[PDB]
RNA sequence: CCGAGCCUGGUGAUAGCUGGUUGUCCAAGAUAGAAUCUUAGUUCAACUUUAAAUUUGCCCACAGAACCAAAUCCCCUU
C-alpha cells in the first residue's frame, strides 16, 4: 500500500523511535509547583 | 490633635468632604450628555407595529449557524502521515 | 557544596549481552507453541507474585496467606502490622469516598 | 535514596547571579535573596509605566520653564499650538527648548500670537476676518 | 534589571551606512553531528538552506564541521571581535534559518 | 475493517447519507484504524447500501 | 536650520523636504522580565520577552525652494 | 592572545574573498594577497626555513593615493582653510589611531601576514595603506576615492 | 584544610632580562594550629601590618599579648628563611605586605552550667599567615588635600550632562 | 514533672484541632438553603469545573396576577 511504500522511504523501525498512539496516555498529575501545590486539591 | 474616632470613611462619625467645583464640573457635563441623550432617544424612527418583525429572518438563521456549529462538534481525522512522520527522529546522514 | 568536583568512571553498557541479546525471546511461546505454555509461568521471581499484579495492601495479604507459615517470626509480625494499617488507611483515609 | 536532585547549585546560582549586586546576607543566602530577587523584578515591572510617567512630567518641566523663560505659559503655550495645528509632542517640544533655542522662541512667539488672535476674536464677537494663523487647515 | 546589569549607548560599528552599509557578520562556524537525532534540524538545514545562504551573504564565510557532538552550535564572529555561539540543539530548519538570519542582521 | 481509498468511503457515505438528513453527515476518518465514524445512528442503512455495493 | 524653520500643519509637504534613511540593523532588545507577585495567596508569574528593534541611520536631510 | 589564523576554523583564501565581497570591491586576488604581506613575515619564515613581494611598493601607492585624495576632498569641502589646518587634518586622518582603529574594524589585522600579534599599530597602517594601494591598481582612482571617503571622512 | 601559603613560598620565576626592574623578593610564611583566638590575632596582625621588619619586631616584642610573642617568633623565622634561602640581601631590607590571621580547627568541649543545662565550649585555634616584601616600607598614603577635594567637586561640576534629552 | 510508677509491646493508637505540604506556563473559577449530640464538621441541595448531546437562553410588547411604595411575575418583538 502507499503507507507500506513510505515505510519503504522512511527510516527503520527501531526501539528508539516508537511512540504511543496519541491520547492513550493521559499524563499523571501530581502534587508539585505553583499550580498543583500548596494544599494539593 | 483633630482625630476621626475609628475609620475616616464609615460609621457614624465620618471625616467630612466637601465638594469642589471643578467635581461640580464634571457633574454638569456628564448631566449636559445625558440630557441630549434623552432628545435624540425621544425621537424613535419607527413604531413597535411597523417593526414587529423586520429581523426575524436574520435572528432565525444566525440561531441555526450556532446550532450547526454546536452540532458539527466532533473528534479530528487521523493520519497515516503523521504516525510515520515520528519514525523520522532517527534520520541520519549516513 | 552538594556536587562532584571530579567526572564519574565512565558507565561502559555492553548491548549485545547473552541477556539483551536474547530478551524478549519465547514470550510469544503461548501463541506459537499450540498454546502448551505461558508466559506468566515464563516469568520467575517469588512464589507469591508470578502472574499476578495486585496493589500494595492485595500483595501483602497474597504473601500472608501463600508463605505466611514458612515465615520468620519479626517479619510476620511486621507483615500483620502492616496488612492492619493498610486495611485501616484504604478502607478510612483518603479524599474519595 | 534513588532520584535525588544533583543541580540545585545551579538552581541556586540562577537566583544568586541576579542577588549578586545586593547588600548584606541577602546577597549569597538563597532564602534571603530569593525572597528579594522576587521584589525586585515586580520594581521592574512597575517601574516601567512609572518611568513614562515621570519622563513626561520631566517633559513638561522643561517646557514649562521655557515658556517662562520667554514669558509664556505652559497651557497657552500647548493650547496655542494645538489651535495652530503643530502636533509637536513634549519630548520634542522639550529638545527644541534645550538645542534649538531660536526656533524654540519661534514658536513661542507663534503661540503668542495665536493667543491674541483668539482674545481679538472672543472680544469682537461679530464676524471679522478670523485672523491670519486661526485658520484652520481642512483635510477630506 | 537594568541596575544589576550592564549598558550602554546606541551605536553603530564603523559609522556603518554613512558611505555605505557592510554587514558585520563575518563568519558563521556550524558544529554537527551525523548520526545525532539532536542534530536532525541542523541536518536538514546544512542539505537545503546553507548553500542559497552562502550564496545571498558572499561576505559571510560558512564553515561546517560534521563531527560527533551532542548539541551542535553555531559560533558567530562579527568585524568588532563579536562571537555567539548559539545551541541550534533540537530545532527545526525553519527555526535555524530564523536563528541565522537574524545572526547575519545582527551587528 | 476498510482498505483503500477510506477518503473515497468518506465521500460516498457523505453523500449517501445526506438526503437522509439534509445536512452532510458529521464523520471522523481514521486511516491508522482503517475506520470511519459517523454521528449519529445509521447501522441499518450502512449495512444495507454495503451489502447492495457488493461488500 | 539656522536662521529660519519650516512648520508643517500638520505635516509639510513632500515636494518641500526628504527625510533619508538607511536600515543598518535588525536586532533584539536585551531581555525584559515581566514578573508578577501577589503575596499570601501564592501568585507569582516571571516572563522574559525580546522585543525586536530596528537601527535606522538618517542619512540626508534636504529641502527644496517651494514655499 | 593568539591569531585567528592559529584559532581552529580558517581557510586563508576564503576570508580573502569575503574580505573582498563584503566590502564590495572588485579586488585582485594576488594584489590583495601581497598587500598583506609583510616584510616582517618574510624575514621570520625565512629564519624558521634556516630552522614573497612585500607591501612595500603597494603600501607607498595607498599612501600617496591616500594624502592626495583626502587632500583633494578636504580643500574642496572646506576652501578656506590653510595648508596647515589641512595638512593637519590629513595626518589626522591617516594617522595611526584613526587607521588602525578602521583596519580592525574591517578585519585587516586577521588577515595581516606579520611576525608578532598583536600586530604592531606601524605595521597595521602600512597592510592598511598596501589594501588601499591594491585597491587603487585594481579599480582605479575614481573607486578608490569612494573607498577612502567612505572609511576616513566617516572617521 | 589547605596549605597553599608553603608552595606560594615555591613559585619559581624565570631569568630576568637586564633591562627590567629588579623585581623585590617575596617570602610567605605561616603558623598553623595556634592555641589562640583569631579576632585577637587579627588585631595584633592589623597592627603589624605594612611596617618595617624591625619595626614589627620592637612593637610586638613590647605588647603584652601571647600572639604578639607567636608573631615576633614567626618574624623572626621568616627573616632567617629570607636572608638564608631566597637570596634577600639585607636582613632590615624587608616590609610586611600581608599579615593575617586564619580559624584553625578547633575542639568541642561541655561547659557544666546550672540545673541540669550545658554548654558547648570551644577549644579555639587560629593561623598566622605574613608576607614579607624587600624593599623598604611604601610610603603610606598622604591624607587629602584641599586642593583635591576642590579638584574632585570640579571634575564632577564639568562631568555634568544633560540627562534625558538628545 | 504519681488524681495513679517505669519500660517494652498492641502502635504508624486516635484527633471534626493546630502546624506543614517541594518544577514552569496558561485558562475557567466567590459563596439561596435543609437536616444533623449540629452550628470549629459532614450529607443533600445551590454555586463552580470538564467532556458530550440538543435547542432555544437572557432583554422583554400589549394584554393578564384579591378581597380584606420602589418594584416583581408573565412576556411577542428586538
Ligand atoms: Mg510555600
Ligand atoms: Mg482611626
Ligand atoms: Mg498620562
Ligand atoms: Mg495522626
Ligand atoms: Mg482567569
Ligand atoms: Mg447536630
Ligand atoms: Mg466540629
Same mark, same amino acid.
Given at each position: 500500500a502507499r503507507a507500506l511504500d513510505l515505510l519503504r522511504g522512511l527510516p527503520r523501525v527501531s526501539l528508539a523511535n516508537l511512540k504511543p498512539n496519541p491520547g492513550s496516555k493521559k499524563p499523571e498529575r501530581r502534587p508539585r509547583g505553583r499550580r498543583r501545590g500548596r494544599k494539593c486539591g | 490633635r483633630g482625630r476621626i474616632p475609628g475609620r475616616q470613611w464609615i460609621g457614624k462619625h465620618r471625616r467630612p468632604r466637601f465638594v469642589s467645583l471643578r467635581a461640580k464640573q464634571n457633574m454638569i457635563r456628564r448631566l449636559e450628555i445625558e440630557a441630549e441623550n434623552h432628545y435624540w432617544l425621544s425621537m424613535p424612527y419607527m413604531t413597535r407595529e411597523q417593526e414587529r418583525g423586520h429581523a426575524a429572518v436574520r435572528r432565525r438563521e444566525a440561531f441555526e449557524a450556532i446550532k450547526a456549529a454546536a452540532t458539527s462538534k466532533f473528534p479530528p481525522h487521523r493520519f497515516i502521515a503523521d504516525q510515520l512522520d515520528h519514525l523520522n527522529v532517527t534520520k541520519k546522514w549516513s | 557544596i552538594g556536587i562532584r568536583l571530579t567526572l564519574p568512571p565512565p558507565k561502559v553498557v555492553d548491548r549485545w549481552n547473552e541477556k539483551r541479546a536474547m530478551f524478549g525471546v519465547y514470550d510469544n511461546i503461548g501463541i506459537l507453541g499450540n498454546f502448551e505454555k505461558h508466559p506468566k509461568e515464563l516469568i520467575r521471581g517469588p512464589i507469591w507474585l508470578r502472574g499476578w499484579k495486585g496493589n500494595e495492601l492485595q500483595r501483602c495479604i497474597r504473601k500472608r496467606k501463600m508463605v505466611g507459615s514458612r515465615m520468620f517470626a519479626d517479619d510476620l509480625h511486621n507483615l500483620n502490622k502492616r496488612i492492619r494499617y493498610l486495611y485501616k488507611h484504604f478502607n478510612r483515609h483518603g479524599k474519595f469516598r | 535514596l534513588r532520584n535525588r536532585v544533583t543541580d540545585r547549585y545551579f538552581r541556586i546560582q540562577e537566583v544568586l547571579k541576579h542577588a549578586r549586586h545586593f547588600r548584606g546576607r541577602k546577597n549569597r543566602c538563597y532564602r534571603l535573596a530569593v525572597r528579594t530577587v522576587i521584589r525586585a523584578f515586580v520594581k521592574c515591572t512597575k517601574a516601567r509605566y512609572l518611568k513614562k510617567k515621570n519622563m513626561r512630567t520631566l517633559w513638561i518641566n522643561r517646557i514649562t520653564a521655557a515658556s517662562? @523663560?520667554?514669558?509664556?505659559?505652559?497651557?497657552?503655550?500647548?493650547?496655542?499650538? /494645538?489651535?495652530?495645528? /503643530? @502636533?509637536?509632542?513634549?519630548? /520634542?517640544?522639550?529638545?527644541?527648548?534645550?538645542? @534649538?533655542?531660536?526656533?524654540?522662541?519661534?514658536?513661542?512667539?507663534?503661540?503668542?500670537?495665536?493667543?491674541?488672535?483668539?482674545?481679538?476674536?472672543?472680544?469682537?464677537?461679530?464676524?471679522?476676518?478670523?485672523?491670519?494663523?486661526?485658520?484652520?487647515?481642512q483635510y477630506h | 534589571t537594568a541596575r544589576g546589569t550592564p549598558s550602554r549607548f546606541l551605536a553603530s560599528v564603523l559609522h556603518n551606512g554613512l558611505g555605505r552599509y557592510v554587514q558585520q557578520l563575518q563568519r558563521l562556524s556550524f558544529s554537527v553531528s551525523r548520526d545525532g537525532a539532536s542534530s536532525r534540524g541542523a541536518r536538514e538545514f546544512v542539505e537545503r538552506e546553507v548553500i542559497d545562504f552562502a550564496r545571498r551573504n558572499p561576505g559571510v564565510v560558512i564553515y561546517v564541521n560534521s563531527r560527533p557532538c551532542c548539541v551542535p552550535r553555531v559560533v558567530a564572529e562579527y568585524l568588532n571581535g563579536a562571537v555567539?555561539?548559539?545551541?541550534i540543539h533540537?530545532?527545526?530548519?525553519?527555526?535555524?534559518?530564523?536563528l541565522v538570519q537574524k545572526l547575519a542582521d545582527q551587528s | 475493517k476498510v482498505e483503500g481509498d477510506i477518503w473515497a468511503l468518506q465521500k460516498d457515505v457523505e453523500d449517501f447519507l445526506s438526503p437522509l438528513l439534509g445536512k452532510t453527515p458529521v464523520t471522523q476518518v481514521n486511516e491508522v484504524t482503517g475506520t470511519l465514524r459517523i454521528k449519529g445512528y445509521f447501522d441499518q442503512e450502512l449495512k444495507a447500501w454495503l451489502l447492495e455495493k457488493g461488500f | 536650520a539656522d536662521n529660519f524653520t519650516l512648520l508643517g500643519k500638520p505635516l509639510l509637504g513632500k515636494d518641500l523636504?526628504?527625510?533619508?534613511?538607511?536600515?543598518?540593523?535588525?536586532?533584539?532588545?536585551?531581555?525584559?522580565?515581566?514578573?508578577?507577585?501577589?503575596?499570601?495567596?501564592?501568585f507569582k508569574k516571571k516572563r522574559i520577552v525580546t522585543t525586536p528593534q530596528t537601527v535606522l541611520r538618517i542619512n540626508s536631510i534636504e529641502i527644496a525652494p517651494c514655499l | 592572545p593568539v591569531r585567528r589564523s592559529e584559532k581552529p576554523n580558517w581557510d586563508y583564501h576564503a576570508e580573502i574573498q569575503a574580505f573582498g565581497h563584503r566590502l564590495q570591491e572588485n579586488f585582485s586576488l594576488d594584489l590583495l594577497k601581497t598587500a598583506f604581506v609583510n616584510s616582517c613575515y618574510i624575514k621570520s619564515e625565512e629564519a624558521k626555513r634556516q630552522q614573497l613581494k612585500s607591501n612595500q611598493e603597494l603600501?607607498?601607492?595607498?599612501?600617496?593615493?591616500?594624502?592626495?585624495?583626502?587632500?583633494?576632498?578636504?580643500?574642496?569641502?572646506?576652501?578656506?582653510?590653510?595648508?596647515?589646518?589641512?595638512?593637519?587634518?590629513?595626518?589626522?586622518?591617516?594617522?595611526?589611531?584613526?587607521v588602525c582603529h578602521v583596519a580592525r574594524n574591517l578585519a585587516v589585522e586577521q588577515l595581516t601576514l606579520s611576525e608578532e600579534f598583536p600586530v604592531p599599530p606601524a605595521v597595521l597602517q602600512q597592510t592598511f595603506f598596501a589594501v588601499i594601494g591594491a585597491l587603487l591598481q585594481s579599480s582605479g582612482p575614481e573607486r578608490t576615492a569612494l573607498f577612502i571617503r567612505d572609511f576616513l571622512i566617516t572617521q | 584544610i589547605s596549605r597553599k601559603w608553603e608552595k606560594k613560598?615555591?613559585?619559581?620565576?624565570? %631569568?630576568?632580562? %637586564?633591562?627590567?626592574?629588579?623585581?623585590?623578593?617575596?617570602? *610567605?610564611? &605561616?603558623?598553623?594550629?595556634?592555641?589562640?583566638?583569631?579576632?585577637?590575632?587579627? *588585631?595584633?596582625?592589623?597592627?603589624?601590618?605594612?611596617?618595617?621588619?624591625?619595626?614589627?619586631?620592637?612593637?610586638?616584642?613590647?605588647?603584652?599579648?601571647?600572639?604578639?610573642?607567636?608573631?615576633?617568633?614567626?618574624?623572626?623565622?621568616?627573616?632567617?628563611?629570607?636572608?638564608?634561602?631566597?637570596?634577600?640581601?639585607?636582613?632590615?631590607?624587608?616590609?610586611?605586605?600581608?599579615?593575617?590571621?586564619?580559624?584553625?580547627? &578547633?575542639?568541642?568541649?561541655?561547659?557544666?552550667?546550672?540545673?541540669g543545662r550545658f554548654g558547648i565550649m570551644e577549644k579555639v585555634y587560629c593561623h598566622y599567615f605574613v608576607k614579607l616584601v624587600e624593599g623598604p616600607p611604601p610610603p603610606p598614603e598622604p591624607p587629602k588635600t584641599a586642593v583635591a577635594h576642590a579638584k574632585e567637586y570640579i571634575q564632577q561640576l564639568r562631568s555634568r550632562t544633560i540627562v534625558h534629552t538628545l
Open positions: - | - | - | 517662562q @523663560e520667554h514669558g509664556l505659559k505652559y497651557p497657552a503655550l500647548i493650547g496655542n499650538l /494645538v489651535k495652530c495645528q /503643530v @502636533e509637536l509632542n513634549r519630548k /520634542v517640544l522639550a529638545d527644541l527648548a534645550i538645542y @534649538e533655542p531660536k526656533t524654540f522662541k519661534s514658536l513661542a512667539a507663534l503661540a503668542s500670537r495665536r493667543r491674541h488672535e483668539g482674545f481679538a476674536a472672543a472680544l469682537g464677537d461679530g464676524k471679522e476676518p478670523e485672523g491670519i494663523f486661526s485658520r484652520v487647515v | 555567539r555561539e548559539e545551541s533540537c530545532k527545526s530548519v525553519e527555526e535555524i534559518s530564523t | - | 523636504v526628504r527625510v533619508e534613511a538607511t536600515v543598518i540593523e535588525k536586532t533584539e532588545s536585551w531581555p525584559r522580565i515581566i514578573m508578577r507577585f501577589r503575596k499570601r495567596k501564592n | 603600501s607607498e601607492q595607498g599612501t600617496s593615493f591616500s594624502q592626495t585624495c583626502l587632500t583633494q576632498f578636504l580643500e574642496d569641502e572646506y576652501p578656506d582653510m590653510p595648508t596647515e589646518g589641512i595638512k593637519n587634518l590629513v595626518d589626522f586622518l591617516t594617522g595611526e589611531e584613526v | 613560598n615555591k613559585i619559581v620565576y624565570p %631569568p630576568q632580562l %637586564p633591562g627590567e626592574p629588579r623585581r623585590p623578593a617575596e617570602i *610567605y610564611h &605561616c603558623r598553623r594550629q595556634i592555641k589562640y583566638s583569631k579576632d585577637k590575632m587579627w *588585631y595584633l596582625a592589623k597592627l603589624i601590618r605594612g611596617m618595617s621588619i624591625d619595626q614589627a619586631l620592637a612593637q610586638l616584642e613590647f605588647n603584652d599579648k601571647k600572639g604578639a610573642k607567636i608573631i615576633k617568633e614567626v618574624l623572626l623565622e621568616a627573616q632567617d628563611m629570607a636572608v638564608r634561602d631566597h637570596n634577600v640581601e639585607f636582613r632590615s631590607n624587608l616590609y610586611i605586605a600581608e599579615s593575617t590571621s586564619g580559624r584553625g580547627q &578547633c575542639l568541642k568541649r561541655i561547659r557544666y552550667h546550672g540545673r
